[PDB]
Amino acid sequence: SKDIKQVIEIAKKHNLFLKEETIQFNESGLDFQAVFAQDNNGIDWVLRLPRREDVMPRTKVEKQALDLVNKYAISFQAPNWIIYTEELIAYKKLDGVPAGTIDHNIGNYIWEIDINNVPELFHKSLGRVLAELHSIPSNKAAALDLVVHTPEEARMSMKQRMDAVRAKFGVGENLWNRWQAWLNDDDMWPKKTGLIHGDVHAGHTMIDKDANVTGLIDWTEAKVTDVSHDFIFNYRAFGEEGLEALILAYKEIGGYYWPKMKEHIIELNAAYPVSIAEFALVSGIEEYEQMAKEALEV
Ligand SMILES: CC[C@H]1OC(=O)[C@H](C)[C@@H](O[C@H]2C[C@@](C)(OC)[C@@H](O)[C@H](C)O2)[C@H](C)[C@@H](O[C@@H]2O[C@H](C)C[C@H](N(C)C)[C@H]2O)[C@](C)(O)C[C@@H](C)CN(C)[C@H](C)[C@@H](O)[C@]1(C)O
Ligand SMILES: Nc1nc2c(ncn2[C@@H]2O[C@H](COP(=O)(O)OP(=O)(O)O)[C@@H](O)[C@H]2O)c(=O)[nH]1
Ligand SMILES: [Ca+2]
Ligand SMILES: [Mg+2]
């Protein structure tokens, strides 16, 4: 009840007037508490209540990415932080629903689509969305604090991140030689980079009733690098068929394509343990430590 009252008062201080009976809390994270509420005009909002100091420095990158997408992109919605202070971030909820959500059990997906009959519009729409995203001219930005890689630098980045993980955690033997083989295969690696979302998965892909992707949320991992990261979810969730469907739609609307694109994404997928290990470090959450160690094949 006091939580509810505080939400109302913080929102009110930012001229956001809420229906108290609609206020819903997600379980807080280390960084903020996510809150849902409807305003006095019937409009649904998403609030982030900060739980750490230095809100502006820690959100600079996400906000730069959001600014780029809101300026340039028409095929998808992204959060537009109409309220952006150290005390509150809030945006009008995007249309649609997440295609799936990570549950609070094993962590499997609770799906809004039929995993055994994925609508083909999901892949066609996501391919259009990603092709638009990855061609945004991040260079026209006067200021850019996103990580920015050339193709060569994206490869060196993966090499370094892998060495780093093999030295804090160690890395299984056979997994390493796969990784190193991938790194050393010139023809496999893309010759172009782009602005990526960096955390594309069903929980962040908003869909309409026909499973068109209409929006993307949670842009904290945005950067200019290998576009391949935004294809990984499709491969993991939908296998080779959903990966191929996404690549096809992307290529056919003009997205960057190279002959070994599928094979490269599959090798990047095998490097997924690098990202879990890194999250374990930054978050300090014991569950991700054990998750990282199993994924790294100690
Ligand atoms: C397709 C099957 C599965 O789903 C996938 O694999 C997802 C695409 C996967 O994501 C894939 C693909 C990719 C590109 O992230 C979208 C990669 O970074 C991660 C490691 O794995 C998710 C989104 C990961 O969650 C991401 O973990 C990152 C380390 C941080 C990131 N965010 C917070 C910045 C977060 O979203 C996570 C670590 O798997 C979440 C964790 C709580 C529970 N998993 C262990 C479950 C059981 C999954 O295995 C799965 C449901 O069975
Ligand atoms: N349906 C919907 N959910 C949202 C929206 N924005 C945030 N969320 C939800 O709030 C959760 C947390 O928000 P997110 O931006 O991903 O922050 P996180 O807690 O750091 O992952 C998400 O997993 C979504 O379920 C939105 O526009 N629509
Ligand atoms: Ca995030
Ligand atoms: Mg999220």
CATH architecture of 100-296: Alpha-Beta Complex (3.90)
Residue 31 CA to residue 10 CA, distance in Å, equals 17
Residue 49 CA to residue 33 CA, distance in Å, equals 5
Residue nearest to atom 23 of ligand 1 (CA): 201
Resolution in angstroms comes to: 1.5
Strand 44-50's sheet: what is its strand order?
A: 24-25, 32-38, 44-50, 89-92, 83-84
Phi, psi for residue 52 in degrees, rounded to 5: -135, 160
Domain boundaries, the chain: 1-92, 100-296
Contacts of 22 (CB under 8 A, 6+ apart): 36, 37, 38
* CA 188, chain centre distance (Å): 24
Long-range contacts of 76-79 (CB under 8 A, 24+ apart): 76/129, 76/132, 76/133, 76/213, 76/214, 76/215, 76/216, 77/206, 77/214, 77/215, 77/216, 78/215, 78/216, 78/217, 78/219, 79/46, 79/217, 79/219
Residue nearest to atom 25 of ligand 2 (CA): 203
- Say how many Å lie between the CA of residue 217 and the centre of ligand 2: 6
Specify the residue for token string 């023809």: 187
**Residue closest to 16 by CA, chosen among 7, 24, 25:** 7
- Say how many Å lie between the CA of residue 200 and the centre of ligand 1: 9
Residue 256 is labelled as binding a ligand? no
Phi, psi for residue 103 in degrees, rounded to 5: -75, 175
Do 1-92 and 100-296 share a fold? no
**Best probe residue, ligand 2, of 26, 217, 233 (max atoms within 8 Å of C-beta):** 217
Which residues line ligand 2 at a C-beta cut-off of 6 Å?
26, 29, 34, 46, 93-94, 97-98, 203, 217-218
Residue type, 221: E
- Dihedral in degrees, nearest 10, Cα atoms 156, 157, 163, 167: 150
| Sign of the torsion angle spanned by Cα atoms 212, 218, 224, 225 | negative
Helix H, strand E, coil C: the string for the chain is CHHHHHHHHHHHHCCCCECHHHCEECCCCCCEEEEEEEECCCCEEEEEEECCCCHHHHHHHHHHHHHHHHHHCCCCECCCCCEECCCCEEEECCCCEECEEECCCCCCEEECCCCCCCCHHHHHHHHHHHHHHHCCCHHHCCCCCCCECCHHHHHHHHHHHHHHHHHHCCCCHHHHHHHHHHHCCHHHCCCCCEEECCCCCCCCEEECCCCCEEEECCCCCCEEECHHHHHHHHHHHHHHHHHHHHHHHHHHCCCCCCCCHHHHHHHHHHCHHHHHHHHHHHHCCHHHHHHHHHHHCC
Distances (CA, A) of 111 to 102, 119, 202: 9, 13, 8
Experimental technique used to determine this entry: X-ray
Phi, psi for residue 200 in degrees, rounded to 5: -75, 115
CB-CB contact of 47 with 7 (8 Å): yes
CATH architecture of 1-92: 2-Layer Sandwich (3.30)
Residue 116 is labelled as binding a ligand? yes
Residue 142 is labelled as binding a ligand? yes
Residue type, 241: E
Structure tokens at 130: 């990603």
Q: Which residues, chain by chain, have CB under 5 Å from ion ligand 4? A: 218
**For ligand 1, is residue 230 a contact (CB within 6 Å)?**
no
| Sign of the torsion angle spanned by Cα atoms 129, 70, 103, 29 | positive
Specify the residue for token string 């949320």: 217
Active site (annotated) includes residue 199: yes
Residue 214 is labelled as binding a ligand? no
- Say how many Å lie between the CA of residue 202 and the centre of ligand 2: 11
CB neighbours (10 Å) of residue 139?
9
Q: 67, 103, 186, 199: which is the annotated catalytic residue?
A: 199
| Sign of the torsion angle spanned by Cα atoms 210, 213, 214, 215 | positive
**Best probe residue, ligand 1, of 197, 236, 294 (max atoms within 8 Å of C-beta):** 236
Residue nearest to atom 35 of ligand 1 (CA): 199
CB-CB contact of 193 with 154 (8 Å): yes
- Say how many Å lie between the CA of residue 237 and the centre of ligand 2: 20
| Sign of the torsion angle spanned by Cα atoms 61, 67, 73, 74 | positive
Specify the residue for token string 């056919």: 252
